Write an enzyme that holds these catalytic residues in place. Structure first.
Site, PDB file in Angstrom:
ATOM      1  N   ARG A 130       0.857  -1.156   0.000  1.00  0.00           N
ATOM      2  CA  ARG A 130       0.000   0.000   0.000  1.00  0.00           C
ATOM      3  C   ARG A 130       0.882   1.189   0.000  1.00  0.00           C
ATOM      4  O   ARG A 130       0.619   2.218  -0.609  1.00  0.00           O
ATOM      5  N   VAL A 131       1.946   1.019   0.785  1.00  0.00           N
ATOM      6  CA  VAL A 131       3.090   1.843   0.890  1.00  0.00           C
ATOM      7  C   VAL A 131       3.767   2.037  -0.414  1.00  0.00           C
ATOM      8  O   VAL A 131       4.173   3.143  -0.747  1.00  0.00           O
TER       9      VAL A 131
END
Lengths: 466, 487, 167, 66, 58, 467
Positions: B350-351
């Site tokens: 997601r990072v």
């Protein structure tokens, strides 16, 4: 001490011993019971009452009836004098060869070894079965769990393994028929007699049988597992033995546990289970191993309901498996015998190192192509019995050979095979496929691979047709 | 006066309904007559539901339970790096007297808003596919998800092996103290594993917290929290520690069981509710901390080994709401022999990029895309059916990259090796090769640069990044080398 | 409601639910002990087969039983609350519970006022003291016997394991 | 404490009593030997039956060429 | 090849000390124990410290 | 009055209050609380015992421990004094920048406005984002649900929304990061600070942050919802505003309640849900509205449970949803910024009435058009071109321009993007697309519309792209 039946709700005998309640797992003998109606202490429930389980059945029991604690867990005969003897749970000759002559006795909770005793890494064991060795290369002393539904000659296979191996075995073997069909055991027995593996001049047969059939009340069946273990630990450590441990099925144990769970007052679990399942298993699975004091090579039949394996029990099992043999009913249905689920008969273990890459790679290639072939089925659905995209056709055809090439006769099963077993010594296998992979039969018939031994004979077989 | 003494009211099932001890602090360790330990879980109006650590049969009704009067703590320390212990920090290894100087309360909270910091400091695994497509940093939470031996174990292993050089690197942003909580992993398995870590001697910077399969449940249950405390210890000692919580699946079961056995509810999907909370807090206790905490980190790679892509699965759904992405591993590739396993789309960071090497980002940026478009057509008319040429290439490219995205069994990388090979593919140099030969290239190519262009590799490690020169150096090396590799 | 006199010993529910009624009842008017003793007395006025035979037996099925043991036996001098609370327990079947209710009570003027230390060395003789570590040595003149029932054996136990515990 | 370390004593005086008795299957009964033989044989297994008591000798060898 | 020979001898001497430990221990612990209580006044030295716990734990 | 811990079984702290029992919803203070441990009364269980839920400590707890009843439900800091403060559930600085500068306290159970207090008609709120207003016209006080992409800068958008609205109106914002990662809230925080939506200089930033993260007891997170509401009630009523209430996510809320349901021995529901799912939602939604003081316009970031809505709650949510946001990750991926799912940037409240036909119809034309363009996309896509007649092309193009006009340059992420968040008064919007649609602009390029707010800014760019 004596306890009084305070409540009998089936084979859970809630006994109030007020006279001192022995530690849990202590085996109790019911007084007034001429039967060896063992109750195993299950709970010190509080209030002078223990929850016990009769293993056995609770007919004819007046309330209050007196139960006299054996003061220990189950002490049973244990050691070499057992082989060829069929005992049930209570170390009880149902060999009907009478006494089991293991002076050496055991409390039957035998446990998991310690980390330091772990023989940390193991050995591919060969079985001479193409499929096995190739796909789920067996472990000496491992716990291998045969997921498989019923009736496919799982049992036959297992038996077959017994034939190939337990015959040519250095160790001794234990057969724990857990919740097995008495009949099938009867028969099974009779084969063994026949076979002389149960050679009746030998209570040093290659296999000691513990049968703890379905008909028994669960507690017994559940516990037949511990029992058998306890014996086998004798042989393993004491008699050194490379034990082959046939369990059919642990599933029935677990199930037995689950059955009681409710009735132990306990919550069962999701999927009905017994909440403790994991430890139950864990302790058990871990109960057995390869110490540097022998190996218990565990051939564990795992019934897999609806071959559903997310079915928590198998879901767990895998952790305790070392090689997972998932037998594929589909494949069985594909007429194959070995009927196995190839890709799910696995061993996380396999390696181009361990098994050598020839092995490994052949397998990965095989595994690959076949899965891809599944992708191709999808095509075929459009394209038909002799119409596709051609390279792909070749490989398809090869897959069709390959399939067949795994198919292997059975000596036992004139009933399933008609044929007689044809054993493949391993290299001949690896090569067998490696060759097929080499497509050296890319002009040989396809089912000139079906129900064979080594690959040559398959070539031979083509001729025999035309 | 009198000492806090008390009795086991009843016992069975590891559930001691317990008399007395009113004074009981929550999750106080008690000490049993059986010499066993317990945890005072249920503080009932008139009794204590006490979880029995280990077995019960030793115990019986009315037995004395004496308070230990302590809410549990665990040893923490870094001697541990190079220790396989159980959770309590006991030498299951058989090493004996563990250097375990600290002990530290297990229940020490997850840091504040302000204490934390966002991740942006790299991390890696040596697994190209991974580091590339999920670019990594410290302090994280990421679900590793995949089935039995979706290199499953392997996954952890290569990641760990990769850290060796980093551990041979001197930073905390290199030397990653690895923490393996082995949950429900029978000793044989562990043993097997353990042996590996030693061999990789990554074990030296590694604690292995081990609650095997057999274990009593609380023990297993506890183990991560334990792990948690220990890693927070590093975190506060600056240190960026890596915990692999392996697996919460196993925990969940146990724990669920625990509730039920405690009669206590489980929850949704029949399994506990705040086992989420369990974890939520557990994993929140992993963080990327600010500078105050010595940059503090615990990068957490929690693991779930899935049954039937049951993600829908309660905890997975849960977890899905929690991590910083999840690493989806795909079997098909494995059977195909393809290792990595992964389904990528399912895999997520997601990072993404912020902790990523520019080096990689620069070549990888391009790769992700090359696959992306490729993927739709990766799906399209896969069979022996033409495509338009553009796409015939993308497919080729994609396919190449796939091979490239394989990574050998127990064969970790380093970012430059990866970038190198990525560069190779990106700049198209091996579309040229029909796919089988890629692997041969890569190795050869690697052993080649390993000979010369450590000049470059070293450099790339240095710049962390590719300069136009480094590129140019690459460019020839590869092209020519590639030419040499081929012909 | 009426704020409740919850002086422990008692048992807190468990005919502490009862007890505490009388920990407010007996208590007010301070028939605490007066009644504490009523009960003691009563007990055995029970404990003969008034007790089995109809007392805790209903075979009549308590319905008339409770309407005749409200008056044939609950018919006494033990009655400021004593029979009346009986006549409450009765229907409410807590007759079968009574030892414990009494217990709960009796542990009140008799033992509220008790003693309790129990280490592994102790296992108190529970003598009735409001203060501690005093009596707790008078015990050593008490000390003259047992299998170390009240206070312990510290032999097999402490110590005996220890050698084991090292290995 | 030396009722404690009387017992550290009391076992350690049988540190000396047994140790200066002998110790083994001695002060102690046959039992030790009956395992011992097997357990030291396992050590022979733990090394293989390659004699852990004969100085080894070493390979003189050639790989292949043309 | 040298190490195996040596390590065997090491391993034996360790294993023999552990077995001698168990057997030594089983005889020692089974032999000695008695005087703690054959002197009842060595349970009075428990009672003494216990009265010095009584008073002097607080 | 005091209670005693009689039982602690988890964070349901079973308290016998030995002395008087206060409300249900009463905050009790456990005495012995190093961090104020509010127990929220849940039940008056009987026998002077209440069921409470502990919201702080859940360990070390000595049974019998004394609780002195706080005699009311939770009180939390309120007034403007909340603004630009990160309050936790207790409403307490997790800003960790010192205390909140409050004076007002509030029970976080405030009660839903009366029938009369409703601005019976909630009347379209306009955001100044074309895509939003047009396709999903908001209602003032409205509950808007957000389905939408991870890390896109939902938040970026949101920040921009805050900018556009909370800034360009008297609206302040309350953000309840419920069950959120502390981490993202941190990243965001700095980001927010950075963005200036949080201003470390506007002590009263246009945002009060409220966090009720996962690592709390559910109840705390659950109640963080109430809390947030409570603050917003201040801004609505007191500050007369349109408060923007970010509740992120209701899914987590519901779930949080539900987590307790079990433990509470409550029968939950089908699909496992807490039984109270409805009431939970309802009262709360009912507590949001347009008062006749202001609006608490509730913008609810919505993680979608089980990625369906059939999962009862969202269906229910729908009852309370009237402007629906499905963000198109794809459109965003087309580099379009903002880039919602346009046709599922919707509102039940689009009307030829309320928002008038100008809006409505133009939109209807558009929505349709977009689709039509979409329809043609399908053809052409596969068949190359002059697979159309170029009126279709024209519309396609018009649509593209319209499409692009929804893209708006960005202020918050101006740091990345360059340009600025542009704001679109409704008429320019309606008019805007209508014009494009009318082809009145079609003789100009399309990137014109790309990164534009106002239809003029599109027109201007149109001209500009025609160099």
């Amino acid at each position: 001490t004596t306890g009084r039946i305070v409540a009998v709700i089936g084979a859970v005998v809630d006994v109030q011993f007020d006279e001192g309640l022995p530690p849990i797992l202590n085996a109790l003998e019911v007084q007034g019971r001429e039967t060896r109606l063992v109750l195993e202490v299950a709970q010190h429930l509080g209030e002078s009452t223990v929850r016990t389980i009769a293993m056995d059945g609770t007919e004819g029991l007046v309330r209050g009836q007196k139960v006299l604690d054996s003061g220990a867990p189950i002490r049973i005969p244990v050691g070499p004098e057992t082989l060829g003897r069929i005992m049930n749970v209570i170390g009880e000759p149902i060999d009907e060869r009478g006494p089991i002559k293991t002076k050496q006795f055991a409390a039957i909770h035998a446990e998991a070894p310690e980390f330091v005793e772990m023989s940390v890494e193991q050995e591919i064991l060969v079985t001479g079965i193409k499929v096995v060795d190739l796909l789920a290369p067996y472990a000496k002393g491992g716990k291998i769990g045969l997921f498989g539904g019923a009736g496919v000659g799982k049992t036959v296979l297992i038996m077959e393994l017994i034939n190939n191996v337990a015959k040519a075995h250095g160790g001794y073997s234990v057969f724990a028929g857990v919740g097995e069909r008495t009949r099938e055991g009867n028969d099974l027995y009779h084969e063994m007699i026949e076979s002389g593996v149960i050679n009746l001049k030998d209570a040093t047969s290659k296999v000691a049988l513990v049968y703890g059939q379905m008909n028994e009340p669960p507690g017994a069946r559940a516990r037949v597992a511990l029992t058998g273990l306890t014996v086998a630990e004798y042989f393993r450590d004491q008699e050194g033995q490379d034990v082959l441990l046939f369990i059919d099925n642990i599933f029935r144990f677990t199930q037995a546990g689950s059955e009681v769970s409710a009735l132990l007052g306990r919550i069962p679990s999701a999927v009905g289970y017994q909440p403790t399942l994991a430890t139950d298993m864990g302790t058990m699975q871990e109960r057995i191993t390869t110490t540097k004091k022998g190996s218990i090579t565990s051939v564990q039949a795992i019934y897999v309901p609806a071959d559903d394996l997310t079915d928590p029990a198998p879901a767990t099992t895998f952790a305790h498996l070392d090689a997972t043999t998932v037998l594929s009913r589909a494949i069985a249905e594909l007429g194959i015998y070995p009927a196995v689920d190839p890709l799910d008969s696995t061993s996380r273990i396999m390696d181009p190192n361990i098994v050598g890459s020839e092995h490994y790679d052949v397998a990965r290639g095989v595994q690959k192509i076949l899965q891809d072939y599944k992708s191709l089925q999808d095509i075929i659905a459009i394209l038909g019995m002799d119409e596709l995209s051609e390279e792909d056709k070749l490989t398809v055809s090869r897959a069709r050979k390959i399939q067949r090439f795994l198919s292997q006769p059975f000596q036992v099963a004139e009933v399933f095979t008609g044929h007689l077993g044809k054993l493949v010594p391993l290299k001949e296998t690896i090569k067998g496929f490696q060759q097929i992979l080499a497509g050296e039969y890319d002009h040989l018939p396809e089912q000139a691979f079906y129900m064979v031994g080594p690959i040559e004979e398959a070539v031979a077989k083509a001729d025999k047709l035309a | 006066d009198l000492e806090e003494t008390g009795r086991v009211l009843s016992i069975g099932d590891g559930i001691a309904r317990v008399h007395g001890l009113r004074n009981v602090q929550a999750e106080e360790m008690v000490e049993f007559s059986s010499g066993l330990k317990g945890m005072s879980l249920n503080l009932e109006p008139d009794n204590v539901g006490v979880v029995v650590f280990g077995n019960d049969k030793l115990i019986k009704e009315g037995d004395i339970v004496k308070r230990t009067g302590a809410i549990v703590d665990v040893p923490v320390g870094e001697e541990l790096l190079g220790r396989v212990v159980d959770a309590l920090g006991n030498a299951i290894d058989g090493k004996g007297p563990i250097g375990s100087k600290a002990r530290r309360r297990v229940g020490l909270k997850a840091p504040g808003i302000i204490p934390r910091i966002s991740v942006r400091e790299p991390m890696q695994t040596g697994i190209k596919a991974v580091d590339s497509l999920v670019p990594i940093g410290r302090g994280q939470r990421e679900l590793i998800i995949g089935d039995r031996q979706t290199g499953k174990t392997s996954i952890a292993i290569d990641t760990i092996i990769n850290q060796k050089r980093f551990n041979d690197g001197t930073d905390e942003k290199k030397k990653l103290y690895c923490i393996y909580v082995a949950i429900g992993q029978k000793r044989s398995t562990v043993a097997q594993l353990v042996k590996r870590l030693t061999d990789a001697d990554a074990m030296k910077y590694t604690i292995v917290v081990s609650a095997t399969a057999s274990d009593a449940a609380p023990l297993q249950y506890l183990a991560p929290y334990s792990g948690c405390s220990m890693g927070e210890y590093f975190r506060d000692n600056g240190k960026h520690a890596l915990i692999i919580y392996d697996d919460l699946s196993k925990q969940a079961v146990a724990y669920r069981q625990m509730s039920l056995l405690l009669r206590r509810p489980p929850g949704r999907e029949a399994y506990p509710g705040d086992v989420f909370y369990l974890h939520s807090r557990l994993l929140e206790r992993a963080a990327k901390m600010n500078d105050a905490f010595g940059g503090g980190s615990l990068t957490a790679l929690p693991v779930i080994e899935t049954q039937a892509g049951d993600v829908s699965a309660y905890i997975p759904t849960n977890v899905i709401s929690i991590t910083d992405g999840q690493i989806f591993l795909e079997t098909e590739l494995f059977y195909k022999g393809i290792r990595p396993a992964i389904n990528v789309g399912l895999s997520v960071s997601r990072v993404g990029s912020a902790a990523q090497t520019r080096a990689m980002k620069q070549v990888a940026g391009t790769m992700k895309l090359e696959l992306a478009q490729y993927r739709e057509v990766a799906a399209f008319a896969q069979f022996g059916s033409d495509l338009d040429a553009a796409t015939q290439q993308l497919l080729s490219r994609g396919v190449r990259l796939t091979e490239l995205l394989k990574q050998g069994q127990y064969s970790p990388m380093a970012i430059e090796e990866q970038v190198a090979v990525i560069y190779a593919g990106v700049r198209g140099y091996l579309d040229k090769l029909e796919p089988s030969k890629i692997t041969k290239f890569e190795n050869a190519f690697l052993s080649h640069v390993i000979s010369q262009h450590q000049a470059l590799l070293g450099k790339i490690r240095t710049d962390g990044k590719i300069s136009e020169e480094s590129d140019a150096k690459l460019k020839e090396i590869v092209t020519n080398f590639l030419a040499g590799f081929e012909a | 409601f009426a704020k409740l006199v919850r002086p422990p010993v008692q048992i807190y529910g468990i005919e502490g639910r009862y007890a505490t009624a009388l920990y407010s009842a007996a208590s007010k008017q301070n028939k605490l002990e007066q009644v504490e003793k009523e009960l003691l007395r009563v007990g055995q006025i029970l404990k003969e087969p008034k007790m089995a035979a109809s007392l805790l037996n209903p075979y009549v099925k308590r319905s008339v039983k409770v309407k005749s043991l409200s008056d044939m036996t609950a018919k006494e001098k033990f009655s400021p609350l004593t029979s009346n609370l009986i006549n409450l327990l009765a229907e409410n079947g807590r007759l079968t519970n009574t030892p414990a209710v009494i217990s709960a009570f009796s542990t009140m003027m008799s033992v509220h006022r008790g003693e309790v230390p129990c280490t592994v060395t102790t296992a108190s003789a529970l003598d009735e003291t409001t203060l501690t570590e005093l009596k707790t040595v008078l015990k050593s003149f008490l000390s003259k016997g047992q299998v170390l029932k009240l206070e312990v054996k510290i032999d097999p136990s402490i110590m005996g394991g220890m050698i084991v515990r090292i290995g | 404490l030396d009722p404690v370390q009387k017992l550290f004593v009391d076992k350690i005086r049988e540190y000396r009593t047994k140790r200066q008795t002998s110790g083994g299957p001695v002060d102690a009964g046959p039992e030790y030997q009956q395992d011992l033989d097997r357990e030291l044989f396992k050590l022979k297994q733990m090394y293989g039956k390659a004699d852990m008591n004969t100085f080894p000798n070493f390979t003189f060898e050639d790989p292949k060429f043309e | 090849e040298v190490k195996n020979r040596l390590d065997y001898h090491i391993s034996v001497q360790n294993m023999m000390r552990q077995k001698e430990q168990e057997h030594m221990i089983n005889w020692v612990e089974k032999r000695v124990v008695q005087s703690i209580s054959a002197q009842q006044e060595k349970e009075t030295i428990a009672k003494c410290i216990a009265d010095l716990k009584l008073l002097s734990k607080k």
